[PDB]
Design a protein around this nucleic acid. Structure first.
Ligand SMILES: [Mg+2]
Ligand SMILES: [Mg+2]
Ligand SMILES: [Mg+2]
Ligand SMILES: [Mg+2]
Ligand SMILES: [Mg+2]
Ligand SMILES: [Mg+2]
Ligand SMILES: [Mg+2]
Ligand SMILES: [Mg+2]
Ligand SMILES: [Mg+2]
Ligand SMILES: [Mg+2]
Ligand SMILES: [Mg+2]
Ligand SMILES: [Mg+2]
Ligand SMILES: [Mg+2]
Ligand SMILES: [Mg+2]
Ligand SMILES: [Mg+2]
Ligand SMILES: [Mg+2]
Ligand SMILES: [Mg+2]
Ligand SMILES: [Mg+2]
Ligand SMILES: [Mg+2]
Ligand SMILES: [Mg+2]
Ligand SMILES: [Mg+2]
Ligand SMILES: [Mg+2]
Ligand SMILES: [Mg+2]
Ligand SMILES: [Mg+2]
Ligand SMILES: [Mg+2]
Ligand SMILES: [Mg+2]
Ligand SMILES: [Mg+2]
Ligand SMILES: [Mg+2]
Ligand SMILES: [Mg+2]
Ligand SMILES: [Mg+2]
Ligand SMILES: [Mg+2]
Ligand SMILES: [Mg+2]
Ligand SMILES: [Mg+2]
Ligand SMILES: [Mg+2]
Ligand SMILES: [Mg+2]
Ligand SMILES: [Mg+2]
Ligand SMILES: [Mg+2]
Ligand SMILES: [Mg+2]
Ligand SMILES: [Mg+2]
Ligand SMILES: [Mg+2]
Ligand SMILES: [Mg+2]
Ligand SMILES: [Mg+2]
Ligand SMILES: [Mg+2]
Ligand SMILES: [Mg+2]
Ligand SMILES: [Mg+2]
Ligand SMILES: [Mg+2]
Ligand SMILES: [Mg+2]
Ligand SMILES: [Mg+2]
Ligand SMILES: [Mg+2]
Ligand SMILES: [Mg+2]
Ligand SMILES: [Mg+2]
Ligand SMILES: [Mg+2]
Ligand SMILES: [Mg+2]
Ligand SMILES: [Mg+2]
Ligand SMILES: [Mg+2]
Ligand SMILES: [Mg+2]
Ligand SMILES: [Mg+2]
Ligand SMILES: [Mg+2]
Ligand SMILES: [Mg+2]
Ligand SMILES: [Mg+2]
Ligand SMILES: [Mg+2]
Ligand SMILES: [Mg+2]
Ligand SMILES: [Mg+2]
Ligand SMILES: [Mg+2]
Ligand SMILES: [Mg+2]
Ligand SMILES: [Mg+2]
Ligand SMILES: [Mg+2]
Ligand SMILES: [Mg+2]
Ligand SMILES: [Mg+2]
Ligand SMILES: [Mg+2]
Ligand SMILES: [Mg+2]
Ligand SMILES: [Mg+2]
Ligand SMILES: [Mg+2]
Ligand SMILES: [Mg+2]
Ligand SMILES: [Mg+2]
Ligand SMILES: [Mg+2]
Ligand SMILES: [Mg+2]
Ligand SMILES: [Mg+2]
Ligand SMILES: [Mg+2]
Ligand SMILES: [Mg+2]
Ligand SMILES: [Mg+2]
Ligand SMILES: [Mg+2]
Ligand SMILES: [Mg+2]
Ligand SMILES: [Mg+2]
Ligand SMILES: [Mg+2]
Ligand SMILES: [Mg+2]
Ligand SMILES: [Mg+2]
Ligand SMILES: [Mg+2]
Ligand SMILES: [Mg+2]
Ligand SMILES: [Mg+2]
Ligand SMILES: [Mg+2]
Ligand SMILES: [Mg+2]
Ligand SMILES: [Mg+2]
Ligand SMILES: [Mg+2]
Ligand SMILES: [Mg+2]
Ligand SMILES: [Mg+2]
Ligand SMILES: [Mg+2]
Ligand SMILES: [Mg+2]
Ligand SMILES: [Mg+2]
Ligand SMILES: [Mg+2]
Ligand SMILES: [Mg+2]
Ligand SMILES: [Mg+2]
Ligand SMILES: [Mg+2]
Ligand SMILES: [Mg+2]
Ligand SMILES: [Mg+2]
Lengths: 10, 77, 46
RNA sequence: AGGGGCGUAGUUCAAUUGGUAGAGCACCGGUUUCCAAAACCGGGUGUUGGGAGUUCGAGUCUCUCCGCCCCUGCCA
RNA sequence: CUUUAAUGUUUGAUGUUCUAACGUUGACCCGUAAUCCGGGUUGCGGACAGUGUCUGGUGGGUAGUUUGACUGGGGCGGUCU
RNA sequence: AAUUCCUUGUCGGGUAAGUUCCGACCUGCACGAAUGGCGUAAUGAUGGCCAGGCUGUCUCCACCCGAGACUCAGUGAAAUUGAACUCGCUGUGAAGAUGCAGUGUACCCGCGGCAAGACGGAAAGACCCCGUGAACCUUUACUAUAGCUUGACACUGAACAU
RNA sequence: UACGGUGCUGAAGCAACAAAUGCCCUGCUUCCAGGAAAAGCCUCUAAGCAUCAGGUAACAUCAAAUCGUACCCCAAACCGACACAGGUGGUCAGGUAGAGAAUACCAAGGCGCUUGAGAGAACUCGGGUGAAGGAACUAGGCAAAAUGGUGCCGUAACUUCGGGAGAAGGCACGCUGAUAUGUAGGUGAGGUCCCUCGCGGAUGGAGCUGAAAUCAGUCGAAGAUACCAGCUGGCUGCAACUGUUUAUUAAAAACACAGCACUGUGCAAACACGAAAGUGGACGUAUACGGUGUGACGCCUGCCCGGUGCCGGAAGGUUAAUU
RNA sequence: CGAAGGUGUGCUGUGAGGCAUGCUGGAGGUAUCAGAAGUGCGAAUGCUGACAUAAGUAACGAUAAAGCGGGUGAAAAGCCCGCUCGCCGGAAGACCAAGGGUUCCUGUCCAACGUUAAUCGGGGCAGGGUGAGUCGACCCCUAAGGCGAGGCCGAAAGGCGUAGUCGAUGGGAAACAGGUUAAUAUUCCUGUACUUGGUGUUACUGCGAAGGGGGGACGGAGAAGGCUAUGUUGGCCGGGCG
RNA sequence: UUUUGUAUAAUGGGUCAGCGACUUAUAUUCUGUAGCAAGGUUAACCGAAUAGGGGAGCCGAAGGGAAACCGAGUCUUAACUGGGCGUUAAGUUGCAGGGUAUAGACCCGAAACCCGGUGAUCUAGCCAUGGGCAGGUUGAAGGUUGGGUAACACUAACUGGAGGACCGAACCGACUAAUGUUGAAAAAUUAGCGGAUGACUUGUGGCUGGGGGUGAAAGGCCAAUCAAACCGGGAGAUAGCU
RNA sequence: UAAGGUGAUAUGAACCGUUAUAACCGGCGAUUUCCGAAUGGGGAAACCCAGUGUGUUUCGACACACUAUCAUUAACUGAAUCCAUAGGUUAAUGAGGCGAACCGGGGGAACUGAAACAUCUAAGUACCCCGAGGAAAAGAAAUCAACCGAGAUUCCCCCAGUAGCGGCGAGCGAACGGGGAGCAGCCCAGAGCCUGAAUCAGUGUGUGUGUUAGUGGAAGCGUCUGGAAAGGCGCGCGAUACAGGGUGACAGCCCCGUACACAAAAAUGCACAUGCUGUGAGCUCGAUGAGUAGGGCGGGACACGUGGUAUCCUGUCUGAAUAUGGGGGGACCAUCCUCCAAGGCUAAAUACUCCUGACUGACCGAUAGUGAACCAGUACCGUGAGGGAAAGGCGAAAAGAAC
């Protein structure tokens, strides 16, 4: 599994 | 459990209605009461868990007659 | 780092053992299902 | 910016809301007081923000235009 | 007919006093080697309380859901015949 | 001000220069008294600010010691991948070209390196919107309901007084 | 004799000193938060036996079954998919230095971590040193550097008088000799008295152990020389504080907190878990318990009952089942 | 006298195709006209299996450290022996519980397993190995708690709970030293002890409960004193004259 | 593939082989075809049984009107010269096919809802019974002896050993930075850091179960999963979307 | 039944048999450790610990047997409390659990559909619980019809997607009547006169027909190709057997069978007959199911959702008539028909297949068909419930390759 890389563009 | 020892009345299930006819499950339980009945033949008091409808039939049928059926029923008064 | 499994034979038998499972009908239904399935090992007891 | 409210006597507010604008204080005049005030009597005051319309008739109804308030102008 | 005074009746409204239903998580005895339970004795309470059916009120305590569209993205504003 | 939008408010202190800090001012956009107010020693891997010491943090990096990286031998992966004979420029073009047009350049092929591009790899975008989607949560949204509460009747009787 | 081994023989086998976290000690002292049970065991008698049985004592004698027992057990054997830089409870506790189970070097004992060999580029990681300047770096003194011990001197604002405080700041530390050839102290034999007599008492001081201080000398750039081992001060916001929290990006000003106030609750208590029985509350009783908000302490906590709740009232209006 | 299938080749039709043949294979196949469909695959980040790519690239698991001689062997950086060096030493040593289950010892082997090689191994194979009156468990006893005759309650199922009965992490009888195996030992052997019951004998004799009492029997902190484990020194014994 | 539009730098695919999606049942309508024909045809069932029997029924040949009713007419209206719907026109039963309907209905895919179970060997809290916390400081109350008082109070010294006290290992926590990010390790290591006699920590058992638990409260935790665990069932839920 | 045989991987070894005690098959017995309803107590299933009694003796012990709970019945004893009763102790019987679906009953969803969503639908489905049988359930008119009649229940085809129900939406959906399958009627609510009548249930006793081992079972040679003939080419034969399988390539005549014809010491099913043990047939006169029907309230079931809603079931509160009487005929009344509730029993037609045997398939052919053609619910994964694989083919003969 993984943890959604918070490289999030908001 | 909530069982009449004379009439055998037991809880039954039904619906709560409403002005919008919404139906929710409910239970109807008997009007059971523990009463000490005086049995003349044994000159004793025997306690029975009876419904309010059962109380009426005891006067009509006699205390001895109902117990005779109970012994046939094996209810273990 | 301590994990989820710490072996304990006494705890294991008291939780899932044959007598613990068969004590109640729900566990007895597990045995019925495993007997119906044909499991080689019915319970966890050795 | 956008949207709502407001503009009435000298100052603060009523208004009728189609046909005639009042109240309080202030101001003035006369009493009272040695005098001022407090008190008493009497009274005059208004383009109803500006304009342009309605309508027989507008401070009131409609639309802009000034000024003064109250709200919003947010998600990446 | 009104006004109705009294008269019995039929239903209720309280209040008082009982016990016998019922209550006792009061005491005592027995089942009994037992702080359960049941029975007995007694006291207290008592036609209440409590429970059943029906019923009014309350009830995010807990549920099932709704909460529009158009729109120079959406919301806000506006609009819907 | 843990609150102040205008705003780096104004004044003072600290600095060579201080939108932070400290002291005041009050004009409190939009503090405020147990959803506590103001102070407060001690405490704090608490936040902000200042000074001394201290230093390669830096001016500005140099050298050295080890472990990798490199070479040899042995063992031997991975994500990815439509197919490739896989250049630059300018222009065009599902509108940012290795592949089209024009033009320029370029012998064939490794090894060590750097990451500008291949809208590189990872994961059916979390932001935005949509579906007459889902779920939890709130309430004076709707309809109910457990519970609580009211009365009638039953369990439930007697006598008396009004 | 098969490097093992096997067989035979085999000396001394004492004292002093130091010394536990082990033992005396399930003791002693003290405190408030007031600190299991049962059985074995000892004893007492009922009923039931008291000639018996049974009990006590001394011998002889039997019996003591069954199961586990290897090995790993801070790890390559267990939990982590791995012969996995992780996790895993108890017991044992050598020498020197040291306050110490810290730390450094060693003993007993056990290991060198299951790819190596070269080379000695960039770059990266773990480290060492650095001219001059010394925070100019950077969101920020992040990191690193620095401080670091014992003894003594000395130590401010403020304070709830406890603190602040190891405040800051400073001095002395090695070795040798002397005082005193191995001191003060500690330990304590022999000997000599006493004993209703012993694992005795009182003298007695041998022998061991042994700081600390002063003086003198001496070496080095440096004597707490290594390891080990606080950076400090000033202003201010928040929270009183120790504590707790998002296991796996947040340890905080958040939560808790003692305290305070309101409110419910008379004990078959309220309340809560339970269709119910019942249980918790509590084997407690308002100096108690539950709920709510606030959050040590200090000074204090003002005005509004219209709205919404809650509490009280019950005359009237309205109003269900029922009739 | 070579069916399907596969693999070539040739011919042929507008196409999906068809025909024939060489080779492979070695036993089935099937005209024609009808009938019935699990009737046609390139994609669905399709499913399963196989095989590429990156690529002989990264990595080969703590920077505690190795070196040499000899031995065995087809072969030795890695195994055995020896001599050095280095590491831990409140552990990286020793003994257990829990947990594992033979990994223990010996012989044998190197395909796979071991991140390399391996003669070695916790690998493969075959044997051997765990000896108890006193150590544990079992047993007696109870805690929390579980189950629970009857009982109470509950549509059924069931829930709670009394008497009881289970349940250690606690309370209860007793063994130490020495020696020995390739692998076990307070278990075997040697030496010297101890305990609880049963039976019998002898003597003296009040015994006796599901009952009573005592005991078992209990905190935290602190303070010493007396000791031992243990260590140091001296003495003693043996060896040494560098 | 999806689009107004893709060499597009939009999605899909490393490759091959295998598998992989418009079906089935019933009813209904339409077309084709076959049979019979103003008629057509049976169903269940019987039956040596794909025959035959069974005409129970169904459709059609007559419609109009809400209906009673009337009828090649009928309704409307008081009545229609009227107007609406009808009256010449073959249907019916099989077979195949095109649609429709009910079923999963062309295939794959939800997040979820509901039901019954399994989990507190992890973790949270609680219960019972055990264990652990080197060493070094600070020196409360109280006590004794003085000094002071009429007695206190007060004060000094010496004893004392109080604390969610101090410094600091084990133990426990997890604040900063670097590494690591296909890890030695699905959360760790190294150097520092906080607590370290307590609201401490830990071992062994026990108890609380999913709209529930537990929570010094973060929507945290409840077996690497938590704004409603896991497993099975309803179930091929549904998916106007891709 | 037998000349061969000691199960399989799987040889070998040592043996046993050969005309009937080898082996194999069937019937009937014997033995049947431990755990498990588990039953002496306990327990972490396959373990631990007893008590009683009988019988053993080597005086250390040993071997059997019994000892759970509950229900029912009967004895004996036995409280408060004088009798009693509760309770207690024995002794007899019975029950416990497991198992596929089908069946009856007690509870009872949601997703979904309605293009949302409450009524409704899904659906009395899934699921849980209780009980029973080979079937279950139902069942002998207080039924329908309509002025004519039918005559228990169950099942099938119609009636009919009609009448109706329904936010009159989605959807749900009969009955009457008809055609079929199959048909069976009785007892108590009471006494006589008759009398053991019919009938049913037990059992023996035979017959018949099965079941559980078995027996016989027809008919071909030659030649060619080929490793091998069952193929080719010839010439035969059997057939109540040309169903299939095997044999070195395709076999009617090689083998096993098949068609037919037979078989049972023993056990057992079924049916008929018959004998016992119960069981009562018939006749007359009576009797004719009361807290019930009905009603009020709240629900549910009938296709029918409260609607004008009959009918059925009842949680609650009431409450009749009773043959000179009641029920029903879809609100209700009258008339007229029809039936007699408040007590029971009852086969068949019907549903299903864990299991046994035979047979069939325009069903599959190793990624298919059961998850499993293989030591598969295994390996493995998960604390657990649970999840869950991959994996078939040498050749005719192993002749499996001496050297
Ligand atoms: Mg946002
Ligand atoms: Mg809600
Ligand atoms: Mg819904
Ligand atoms: Mg919209
Ligand atoms: Mg600002
Ligand atoms: Mg300034
Ligand atoms: Mg300031
Ligand atoms: Mg505030
Ligand atoms: Mg206030
Ligand atoms: Mg307040
Ligand atoms: Mg601070
Ligand atoms: Mg500085
Ligand atoms: Mg390219
Ligand atoms: Mg371009
Ligand atoms: Mg370019
Ligand atoms: Mg390269
Ligand atoms: Mg680079
Ligand atoms: Mg780079
Ligand atoms: Mg990308
Ligand atoms: Mg998306
Ligand atoms: Mg999204
Ligand atoms: Mg929308
Ligand atoms: Mg004490
Ligand atoms: Mg390890
Ligand atoms: Mg892992
Ligand atoms: Mg492992
Ligand atoms: Mg540990
Ligand atoms: Mg150390
Ligand atoms: Mg060392
Ligand atoms: Mg280097
Ligand atoms: Mg760097
Ligand atoms: Mg340095
Ligand atoms: Mg140097
Ligand atoms: Mg420098
Ligand atoms: Mg310098
Ligand atoms: Mg700067
Ligand atoms: Mg700068
Ligand atoms: Mg720093
Ligand atoms: Mg440093
Ligand atoms: Mg300070
Ligand atoms: Mg500030
Ligand atoms: Mg704090
Ligand atoms: Mg803290
Ligand atoms: Mg975190
Ligand atoms: Mg934590
Ligand atoms: Mg953190
Ligand atoms: Mg607070
Ligand atoms: Mg008021
Ligand atoms: Mg109020
Ligand atoms: Mg074929
Ligand atoms: Mg060919
Ligand atoms: Mg062949
Ligand atoms: Mg297909
Ligand atoms: Mg690959
Ligand atoms: Mg290489
Ligand atoms: Mg490369
Ligand atoms: Mg490389
Ligand atoms: Mg490399
Ligand atoms: Mg290594
Ligand atoms: Mg060597
Ligand atoms: Mg092994
Ligand atoms: Mg070994
Ligand atoms: Mg090899
Ligand atoms: Mg081995
Ligand atoms: Mg022994
Ligand atoms: Mg033993
Ligand atoms: Mg012992
Ligand atoms: Mg019971
Ligand atoms: Mg219980
Ligand atoms: Mg026990
Ligand atoms: Mg124990
Ligand atoms: Mg050993
Ligand atoms: Mg051992
Ligand atoms: Mg000693
Ligand atoms: Mg194009
Ligand atoms: Mg592309
Ligand atoms: Mg792709
Ligand atoms: Mg046709
Ligand atoms: Mg026919
Ligand atoms: Mg007809
Ligand atoms: Mg006409
Ligand atoms: Mg069709
Ligand atoms: Mg379709
Ligand atoms: Mg502390
Ligand atoms: Mg500390
Ligand atoms: Mg601290
Ligand atoms: Mg988790
Ligand atoms: Mg949910
Ligand atoms: Mg599920
Ligand atoms: Mg469904
Ligand atoms: Mg689906
Ligand atoms: Mg037993
Ligand atoms: Mg819907
Ligand atoms: Mg049967
Ligand atoms: Mg034969
Ligand atoms: Mg009757
Ligand atoms: Mg009634
Ligand atoms: Mg009703
Ligand atoms: Mg109506
Ligand atoms: Mg309606
Ligand atoms: Mg009705
Ligand atoms: Mg195949
Ligand atoms: Mg398949
Ligand atoms: Mg398969
Ligand atoms: Mg295969």
């Amino acid at each position: 599994a993984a943890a959604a890389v918070r490289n999030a563009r908001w | 459990s909530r069982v009449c020892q004379v009439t055998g009345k037991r809880p039954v299930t039904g619906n709560n209605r409403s002005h919008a006819l919404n139906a929710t499950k409910r239970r109807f339980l008997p009007n059971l009461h523990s009463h000490r009945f005086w049995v003349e033949s044994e000159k004793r008091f025997v306690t029975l868990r009876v419904s309010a409808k059962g109380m009426r039939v005891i006067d009509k049928k006699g205390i001895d007659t109902v117990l005779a059926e109970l012994r046939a029923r094996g209810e273990k008064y | 780092m301590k994990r989820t499994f710490q072996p304990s034979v006494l705890k294991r038998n008291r939780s899932h053992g044959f007598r613990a499972r068969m004590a109640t009908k729900n566990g007895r239904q597990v045995l019925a299902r495993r007997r119906a399935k044909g499991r080689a090992r019915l319970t966890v007891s050795k």
